[PDB]
Amino acid sequence: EDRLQAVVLTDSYETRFMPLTAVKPRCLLPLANVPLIEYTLEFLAKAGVHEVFLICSSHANQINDYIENSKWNLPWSPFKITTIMSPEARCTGDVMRDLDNRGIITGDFILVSGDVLTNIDFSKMLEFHKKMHLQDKDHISTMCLSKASTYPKTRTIEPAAFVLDKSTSRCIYYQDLPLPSSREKTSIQIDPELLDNVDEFVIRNDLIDCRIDICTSHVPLIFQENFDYQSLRTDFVKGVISSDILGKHIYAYLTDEYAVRVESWQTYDTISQDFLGRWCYPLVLDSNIQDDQTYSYESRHIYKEKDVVLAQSCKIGKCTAIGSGTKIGEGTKIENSVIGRNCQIGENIRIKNSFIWDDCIIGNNSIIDHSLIASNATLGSNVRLNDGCIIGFNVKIDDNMDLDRNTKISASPQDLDDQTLAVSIVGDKGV
Amino acid sequence: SIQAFVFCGKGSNLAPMQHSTRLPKALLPIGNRPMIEYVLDWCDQADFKEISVVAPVDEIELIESGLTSFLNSNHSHHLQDPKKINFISTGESLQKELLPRINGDFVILPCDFVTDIPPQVLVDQFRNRDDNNLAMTIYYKNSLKQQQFFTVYSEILLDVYSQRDVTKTKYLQIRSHLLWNYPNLTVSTKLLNSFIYFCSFELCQLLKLGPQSMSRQASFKDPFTGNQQQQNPPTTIFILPNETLFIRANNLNAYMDANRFVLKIKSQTMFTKNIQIQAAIGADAIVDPKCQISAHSNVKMSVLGTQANIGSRCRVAGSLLFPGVHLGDEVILENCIIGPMAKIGSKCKLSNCYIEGHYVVEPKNNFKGETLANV
Amino acid sequence: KFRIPPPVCLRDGKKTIFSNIQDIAEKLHRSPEHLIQYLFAELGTSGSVDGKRLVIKGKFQSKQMENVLRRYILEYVTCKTCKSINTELKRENRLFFMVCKSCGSTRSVSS
Amino acid sequence: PGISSVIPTVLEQSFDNSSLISVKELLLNKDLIHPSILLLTSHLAHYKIVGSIPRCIAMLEVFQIVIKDYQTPKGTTLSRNLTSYLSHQIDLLKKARPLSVTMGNAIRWLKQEISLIDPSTPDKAAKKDLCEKIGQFAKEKIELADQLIIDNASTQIEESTTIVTYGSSKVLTELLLHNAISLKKNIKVIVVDSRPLFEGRKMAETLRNAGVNVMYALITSLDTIFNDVDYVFLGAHSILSNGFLYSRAGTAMLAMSAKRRNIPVLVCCESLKFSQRVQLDSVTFNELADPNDLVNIDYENPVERRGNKGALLNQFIKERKFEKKKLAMENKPKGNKIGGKKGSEGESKDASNEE
């Protein structure tokens, strides 16, 4: 039950964020107006940590600085942050190998890939895991899966068709399909290797990725043994099914309450929206986590920090949130959009269903629809943006532009159109 | 609009009992009572007048004779013999032949039935959802290998895949367009269809447009997949058959059922051993031989002993009887255990009073008074 | 037999898809359309020809396809008197009469 | 022949006169009775959507169907044991579900029709005309009235709206739909749900089927909402000779709240649903159902958990009952929308003696 170490895969899913992640590390980017790492840390604490470990890689100095800044740094914390520093660029097998080389591995150690923030109480889960362990020697690792709104629709990267058990809760098949977006390989398989032993076959698909694992003493040794598992989902579960290490059990925890991990950009937006609303049991910003935070709760699902001002006569839809150091002008038509920290507003702006990051000037006469504006990137006069316009680092949107739907703009100070220098591409400008 | 179909024929698929041309299958004396008694009872419960009976090429009078013999119904049954079938298929060939005479929705029941489950509630359910087809499923025994395809989905209760396995394919074969919709399917490895069918008017014109009929199970309900493209016009809710789960035992005989049924029977059931006078109020009753009983008798979960006479209006609610008892004129009972020699009656509504040995009941009131032996 | 290529294919649902079919066509020396025709003859499937990986409707198993392939290799092509490899397509009245290039003998295949 | 017996749960102490109990599961009835009516009654009994508007229409339709099917006897005339049959049907209906004001009106109309064409006419001549007449009546007194109401509603909004809503009534839903679509205004809809039979959820579903900006709440959750919001609406079932609102469940509290927060409510009325019967209390005559209406816990309707509660007769020394139809305050709702566009509830019986 007690004494459990935390190991979290950081600096791993870079470039999966299609424009971002190159100069500053993946996790250091400001999520919901305040750093992503903190939420994850809090979650870990809630679960039950005794020492914090992250597998940092991309530019370690900044990570070190962050650690220095952080609250877990000085004596008062039950757990300190001392990140594992390794050679540059390596996969999850390689990461595991590195960890093994380093040495600090325990019995019931915790392994979470990427960054996650959800509500479900973990103590019960832990207890269940322990019980399972107490049953037989062959039990391995824990899966986290949650139910969704009947039919799948906003799921293409990970629409896993889980064939599952009710009596023992154990996986039978795993498949990722591009069927809702590109109808080319519509395929479902039922393997016969565990067919005439289970009998209670349940065919399901409507479940969401969390990538949170409680790992026993078997896992790192297994990793060390088999160099074919460079990944952890598509190869691993299949291998387990196939009985590479013969006759072993895996758990599939099924919860009625909502649980999703961080993956893409629309998904990120959805997560943010959820956080803003009361979709997960207690999660709030107004409670204040990181030192200098001065957040306060308001009615009509509205979040306001201190040093926050919005002016009179703004007839609005529903749900708005503002960061600190913000001055908002007069006469605006707004529906379900979010404005970040130290963002300035002149006059006359229409906004619908949006999220805005750190220090982004919403210029005079501008429309933001389902589109993001990132750190130091600013909007000037007469910009007409549409649904899903992704903006990265230092995109200085200056004078007169019209960008179409689903357009992606490059970040780091290359592969995709529209660049960092003055005005985004409508009339060719750059180097 | 209201009509019932009764199917009755001959069996040859079974291993044993059947050899001569004189004895078919309609008049089987396995254990005193005939096979069709249950069916008759069901019909009585249903209450119907215009019921059509069907027969194949062989035996034209013997079945009629059987129907006549022993006999309550006293209605008007009608039987027809169209001669085109040569035993290859059960009633599809008959259905194809007779179509404009059908008034509306119809209830189909074959001769091979043993029932213990509630009756008209299937019919009512059918009426309710207002769909094309309905069938039921029954579990396998717990007392002393893979069998056949059965899948369920409910939130409402419906059927997705029904195609049987005799020439069984190694992998489980279905459709993914029938999986993308309904994303919480379950494969069952216990179920068995027991020849219960309920159908509607709309499927009477499609048989003449396109003949597809196979064995009344291979194709009778199979067109349900309405996905991808579709290249057939609909006749004027999606065209889907339904499946409903049950608990109590109501099995079928087709491959391996002849010895187990007898065991199930004799050990429980509706008991008859002596002369009876018989619509009646009180479900599930246990009656003994040598006695003489009258009408309007009320029994609520009660087992009698050797010789127990009931005369002129009685209401019994949880009472057990032991050797030799007399009952005459007006008895109402609530929670009693009775011993030897008892003459209970004298008009009373007694609750929580036990009767001991050698006593005649007087018309008097006594609260918490245990019926003691002698004063 | 060594000439049979190892098929690495799992039971892909909804529509029967084969990527190793081209290799089979190549090594055993036969037109891809013939295989499609054979498939059609076997089972009521509807699909269009795609030029290497085929798109044919039907959720069918990996072992039954294997069996079919084996059958094709055996009693559909080859010869009883000689176990020869190279067999080529020639048409002599309307139905197919396959010929072997090692010697020169005619055989009638329809069932 | 037919027998009642066996009643579920405790009978409490108060409200002990109204017929509400018995024949839920079918077990032996009368012989030559047409079963469509029975089926309809059963449907009505196990219904969770119906509210004021459609039931009567459905009944009318059923009657029409019956008439179309009706066979005139080979010896006797069109009405001899027909009346007896009708009486039996009525009794069955009563046993199943109480006959409301609308139902009474329908019965009256039927009687009038009977009086009009009395024992003299053959088969396919009388009923041919009667059916058509009925159809015409249906076309006239109902659909057109509804249309009129809709049109009244259309004009009733001038400049800007923010609304809180409640009710199963179809007319309100229709109005909302109209607001959403063929008016293109700056409409806002906040939904209130009720526990016994679900209406709010249905309303929400309907809104979704259009794609509207929708807030959602319940009976108790009211106070925090009003922290800009103006309009409030309700839907009534029937109004008596007295002028008091003899309608369904959670309306009155909402109305009171609205009054307190200083912007009143408007309810919609029908130019047929008025009764000779006189009542001013809950005890006289009320819609009463089995206590199974308050069993389900959290989120949805079909879940069933074995956690805290799951017994009624076993719950010794306990008196569990609930009300469906309420008698709302007279002075509280301001506007009423009938066939004559607009007017106060000071009308009461200004259509009753009009006949």
Curated annotation (Swiss-Prot), chain A:
GO BP, one annotated term: cytoplasmic translational initiation
Cellular component GO terms, alphabetical: cytoplasm; cytosol; eukaryotic translation initiation factor 2B complex; guanyl-nucleotide exchange factor complex
Origin: domain of life: Eukaryota
Family the UniProt entry places it in: Belongs to the eIF-2B gamma/epsilon subunits family.
Comment field (misc): Present with 33800 molecules/cell in log phase SD medium.
Chain's role: Acts as a catalytic component of the translation initiation factor 2B (eIF2B) complex, which catalyzes the exchange of GDP for GTP on eukaryotic initiation factor 2 (eIF2) and is regulated by phosphorylated eIF2. Its guanine nucleotide exchange factor activity is repressed when bound to eIF2 complex phosphorylated on the alpha subunit, thereby limiting the amount of methionyl-initiator methionine tRNA available to the ribosome and consequently global translation is repressed.
Subunit (UniProt): Component of the translation initiation factor 2B (eIF2B) complex which is a heterodecamer of two sets of five different subunits: alpha, beta, gamma, delta and epsilon. Subunits alpha, beta and delta comprise a regulatory subcomplex and subunits epsilon and gamma comprise a catalytic subcomplex. Within the complex, the hexameric regulatory complex resides at the center, with the two heterodimeric catalytic subcomplexes bound on opposite sides.
Listed name of the protein: Translation initiation factor eIF2B subunit epsilon
UniProtKB/Swiss-Prot annotation, chain B:
Name of the encoding gene: GCD1
CDD domains: eIF-2B_gamma_N, LbH_eIF2B_gamma_C
Top-rank taxon: Eukaryota
Modified residues (Phosphothreonine): 225
Any one of the GO BP annotations: negative regulation of cellular response to amino acid starvation
PTM sites of type Phosphoserine: 215, 219
UniProt protein name: Translation initiation factor eIF2B subunit gamma
Any GO CC annotation of this UniProt entry: guanyl-nucleotide exchange factor complex
Molecular-function GO terms, alphabetical: translation initiation factor activity
Role played: Acts as a component of the translation initiation factor 2B (eIF2B) complex, which catalyzes the exchange of GDP for GTP on the eukaryotic initiation factor 2 (eIF2) complex gamma subunit. Its guanine nucleotide exchange factor activity is repressed when bound to eIF2 complex phosphorylated on the alpha subunit, thereby limiting the amount of methionyl-initiator methionine tRNA available to the ribosome and consequently global translation is repressed.
Lineage: Eukaryota, Fungi, Dikarya, Ascomycota, Saccharomycotina
Source organism of this protein record: Saccharomyces cerevisiae (strain ATCC 204508 / S288c) (Baker's yeast)
Compartment(s) of residence: Cytoplasm, Cytosol
UniProt miscellaneous comment: Present with 9530 molecules/cell in log phase SD medium.
Listed InterPro entries: eIF2B_gamma (IPR051960), GlmU/GlgC-like_hexapep (IPR056818), Nucleotide-diphossugar_trans (IPR029044), Trimer_LpxA-like_sf (IPR011004)
Keyword Aminoacyl-tRNA synthetase assigned: no
Protein family membership: Belongs to the eIF-2B gamma/epsilon subunits family.
Alphabetical UniProt keywords: Cytoplasm, Initiation factor, Phosphoprotein, Protein biosynthesis, Translation regulation
Principal location class: cytoplasm
From Swiss-Prot, chain C:
Top-rank taxon: Eukaryota
Subcellular location: Cytoplasm, Cytosol
Zinc finger map (C4-type): 79-103
Coiled-coil region: none
Subunit structure: Eukaryotic translation initiation factor 2 eIF2 is a heterotrimeric complex composed of an alpha, a beta and a gamma subunit. The factors eIF-1, eIF-2, eIF-3, TIF5/eIF-5 and methionyl-tRNAi form a multifactor complex (MFC) that may bind to the 40S ribosome. Interacts with GCD6. Interacts with GCD1. Interacts with TIF5/eIF-5. Interacts with CDC123.
Function: Component of the eIF2 complex that functions in the early steps of protein synthesis by forming a ternary complex with GTP and initiator tRNA. This complex binds to a 40S ribosomal subunit, followed by mRNA binding to form a 43S pre-initiation complex (43S PIC). Junction of the 60S ribosomal subunit to form the 80S initiation complex is preceded by hydrolysis of the GTP bound to eIF2 and release of an eIF2-GDP binary complex. In order for eIF2 to recycle and catalyze another round of initiation, the GDP bound to eIF2 must exchange with GTP by way of a reaction catalyzed by eIF2B.
Family: Belongs to the eIF-2-beta/eIF-5 family.
Name of this protein: Eukaryotic translation initiation factor 2 subunit beta
Source organism of this protein record: Saccharomyces cerevisiae (strain ATCC 204508 / S288c) (Baker's yeast)
Source organism phylogeny: Eukaryota, Fungi, Dikarya, Ascomycota, Saccharomycotina
Residues of the full protein shown: 157 to 270 of 285
Curated annotation (Swiss-Prot), chain D:
Ranges of compositional bias, category Basic and acidic residues: 342-352
Primary site of residence: cytoplasm
GO CC, alphabetical: cytosol; eukaryotic translation initiation factor 2B complex; guanyl-nucleotide exchange factor complex
Entry's Gene Ontology molecular function annotations: enzyme regulator activity; translation initiation factor activity
Record region (Disordered): 328-355
Gene Ontology biological process: cytoplasmic translational initiation; regulation of translational initiation
Segments forming a coiled coil: none
KW Cytoplasm (keyword) present: yes
Keywords, sorted A to Z: Acetylation, Cytoplasm, Initiation factor, Phosphoprotein, Protein biosynthesis, Repressor, Translation regulation
Any further remark recorded for this protein: Present with 10300 molecules/cell in log phase SD medium.
Role description: Acts as a component of the translation initiation factor 2B (eIF2B) complex, which catalyzes the exchange of GDP for GTP on the eukaryotic initiation factor 2 (eIF2) complex gamma subunit. Its guanine nucleotide exchange factor activity is repressed when bound to eIF2 complex phosphorylated on the alpha subunit, thereby limiting the amount of methionyl-initiator methionine tRNA available to the ribosome and consequently global translation is repressed.
Family: Belongs to the eIF-2B alpha/beta/delta subunits family.
UniProt-recorded name of the protein: Translation initiation factor eIF2B subunit delta
Species whose genome carries this gene: Saccharomyces cerevisiae (strain ATCC 204508 / S288c)
Chain's gene name: GCD2
